[PDB]
């Protein structure tokens, strides 16, 4: 039984390296994704009491 | 027919158990083979040309090589065979009739009245006419054998494996098997391999034996040639003294 | 020493390459060689049978919500939110995980230790040697018949937990009925949250009873191996369903 | 017992159906018909929805 | 026909009030304090091997209740809910009933199957002629390895769905660390929010490990015996945790 042993591996390290493909993509879904062509601007303010990141 | 094995080696679990096993199975012989426990004996047997593979070697069925000859031939080959495993197997989920029944559906297309004769006569030939409509896990011991025989023997095979019957039981089954192996092996002209740990019963039975430890055959014969050819395994495995090739651990200090 | 851990993760994973071979020669649509009277009657062991564990259950974790979800709105003053809080906990994670949980949990263990019981007795060993394949005899309808199942049992689960969570929290502790039912809809949808709370179930579904199989099946035949193969099909069964509804529900809902 | 899994199993189904009903009953949607789409231009939309009503 | 239900309900309830015996004795009377010095090294195997899968499915919950809470929240206030309801959810709900049957599973099919081979290779009742009482000798750490394991467990559960809850409500998904954490202490009152999530943690452990004792100290000496044994340990212990969970949550917060 010796010759079905590798393959049994190399299946392994193949699902195994999908599934952790899998989970880092799906996430992009909600988190690490700027969803847009990513130009910046800046602009200068006197006040911007209560901005937070992420606001529109 | 003649099954003959060839320098067979098969390694399991990092370990030989088998070293170029030279078989000849005489036909229409009963043929038997002994050993100490634990040695490959089920191996051996599964070995035969069901369903292990062997790492070197050759099965050869009719004088033909099984391996790789052909899918269809050896779907059909299969039908000439019958085994009991070990304790036995029955279906817990099939009436008796379905267990006994059960193979006729693997190479046959029957009318269910004739698949409901065959079973009738195939359970009478092992006295277990009347039983049919039981759950299997209902019966005694003594009958869960002679029900899984009777499913062995269900397609009229030619070569009938016993795997060690004689091993634990008691002393009325042991009387009751070895009649229906006298009475079976002649009604239906069969070859049959017993294998077995009890030698006082296997000596009396074969026609030829081998025995067989440490993955090689250490002598062969009809019982009374196994008498004449004391290697001191042999012997000792054969007669059940204490004395022999053995080991017990211990040193003075 | 430290090696021997690096053995036992080495084994494990090997293993599952089995399993994922395993799976796809099963998976294809070969059963159909057979009569499929068997896959009803095999129904009746892993989802007739746990009918009254997932129910009994729905109700209390119902009840629970209910009152949970009460003496805390009671502060907000705001009690419409009853029927909208218990129908998405509900729909999206509880009937979900709950289920997959009771469910393998149950009927994982007891499959597991139906198909090894079958290894160690030898009666596949036996097919081999008839002729009939024991994957379009044994395996096959367990597998089929573990993922029809549990996304029905989730559905009745949420079902009886929704039931069981008006029954308080609505009869019991005086909110008006008209907002339950009007909070449900505002804003949650069959054709959206049910809809992805049955999804993940199929997944759960393959990995509890894949899982079941495998654990029994595909093992050499020690003696100790049902016991423990019965722990270890709870473990994995349970650990791939939380992770896996992580990544589920992050997408779904994010 | 076959006859008894046959004559049984068919409560989960009849279960599966009154609940299933139930399911959509609670959170039914709504059914759009004959639907047409129409545009028009507005100056400002500030916090508008893609569902509003 | 129908008087077959009849038995079975008969004997199954039987044995509960043999259970009830059995516990009697096992913790009225102990005076064998030197042998009980063990009992820490019968701990390993239920508490020590255990923190694997209380870890990992702790992260996997805080992390889900985190997105949940947070796509609900913005709608209503998670500056200060997602800290309020991250905290109450797994203190009251769920540490002391994710982690309780994920315990059930893992330490209760174990722990049964452990006593069963005890029982059925028959050498258990080997001891009774050498003068050892085997609930002295054998039941008496395993049982009390789970009353302290579950309770210790409970806390990780929960300790590590707050680093799952704040690790994306707040540092991924924009929420101050301020209000988090001030919301918290706010609504969270160690008297009795942490303390009944702990009480209700002892009423599971003995709870769940006494059904895991009883079951594996099984009548019949049949070997198909075990299996049947290991899947009702997680079924029974399994309702009674959801059934009295329900009445304790209704008393402690209503
Ligand atoms: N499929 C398997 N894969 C790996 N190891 C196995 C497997 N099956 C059993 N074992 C081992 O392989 C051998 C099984 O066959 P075998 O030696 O022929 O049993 P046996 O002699 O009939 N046993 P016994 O009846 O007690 O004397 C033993 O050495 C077992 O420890």
């Given amino acids: 039984k010796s010759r079905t042993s590798e393959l049994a591996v190399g299946i392994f390290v193949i699902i195994f390296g999908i599934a952790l493909f899998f989970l880092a993509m799906k996430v992009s879904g909600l988190v690490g994704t700027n969803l847009s062509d990513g130009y910046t601007m800046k602009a200068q303010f006197d006040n911007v009491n209560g901005l937070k990141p992420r606001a529109k | ?253 | 020493t430290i090696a021997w851990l690096g053995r036992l993760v080495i084994e494990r994973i090997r293993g599952i390459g089995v399993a994922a071979l395993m799976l796809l020669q099963i998976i294809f649509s070969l059963p159909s060689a057979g009569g499929f009277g068997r896959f009803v009657y095999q129904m009746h062991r892993v989802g007739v049978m746990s009918l009254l564990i997932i129910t009994v259950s729905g109700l209390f974790i119902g009840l629970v919500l209910g009152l949970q979800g009460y003496s805390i709105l009671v502060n907000v003053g705001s009690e419409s939110m009853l029927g909208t809080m218990v129908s998405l906990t509900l729909l999206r994670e509880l009937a979900p995980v709950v289920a997959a949980l009771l469910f393998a949990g149950r009927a994982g263990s007891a499959l597991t230790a139906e198909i090894g019981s079958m290894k160690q007795s030898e009666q596949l060993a036996s097919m081999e040697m008839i002729g009939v394949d024991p994957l379009k005899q044994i395996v096959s309808p367990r597998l089929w018949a573990g993922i029809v199942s549990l996304p029905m049992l989730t559905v009745i689960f949420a079902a009886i937990g929704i039931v069981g969570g008006k029954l308080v929290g609505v009869d019991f502790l005086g909110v008006d009925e008209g907002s339950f039912w009007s909070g449900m809809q505002n804003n949650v949808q069959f054709g959206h949250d049910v809809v992805n709370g049955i999804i993940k179930s199929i997944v759960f579904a393959l990995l509890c009873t894949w899982i079941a199989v495998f654990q029994g099946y595909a093992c050499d035949p020690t003696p100790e191996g049902i016991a423990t193969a019965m722990t270890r099909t709870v473990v994995y069964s349970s650990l791939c369903v939380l992770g896996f509804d992580f990544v589920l529900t992050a997408v779904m809902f994010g």
């Fill in chain 2, 1 to 253: 027919s003649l099954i003959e094995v060839k320098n067979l080696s098969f390694n399991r679990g990092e370990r030989v158990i088998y070293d170029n096993i030279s078989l000849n199975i005489r036909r229409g012989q009963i043929t038997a083979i002994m050993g100490p426990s634990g040695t490959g004996k089920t191996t051996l047997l599964r070995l035969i040309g069901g369903q292990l593979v062997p790492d070197q070697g050759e099965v050869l069925l009719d004088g033909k090589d099984i391996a790789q000859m052909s899918r269809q031939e050896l779907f059909a080959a299969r039908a000439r065979m019958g085994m009991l495993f070990q304790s036995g197997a029955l279906f817990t989920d099939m009436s008796v009739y379905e267990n006994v029944a059960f193979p006729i559906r693997a190479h046959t297309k029957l009318s269910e009245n004739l698949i409901a004769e065959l079973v009738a006569l195939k359970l009478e030939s092992v006295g277990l006419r009347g039983t049919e409509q039981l759950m299997p896990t209902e019966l005694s011991g003594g009958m869960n054998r002679r029900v899984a025989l009777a499913r062995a023997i269900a397609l009229d095979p030619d070569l009938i494996m016993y795997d060690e019957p004689f091993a634990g039981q008691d002393p009325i089954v042991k009387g009751v098997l070895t009649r229906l192996i006298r009475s079976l092996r002649e009604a239906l002209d069969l070859t049959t391999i017993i294998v077995s740990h009890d030698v006082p019963e296997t000596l009396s039975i074969a026609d030829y034996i081998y025995v067989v430890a440490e993955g090689k055959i250490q002598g062969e014969g009809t019982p009374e040639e196994l008498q004449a050819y004391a290697s001191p395994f042999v012997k000792q495995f054969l007669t059940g003294s204490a004395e022999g090739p053995v080991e017990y651990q211990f040193s003075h200090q």
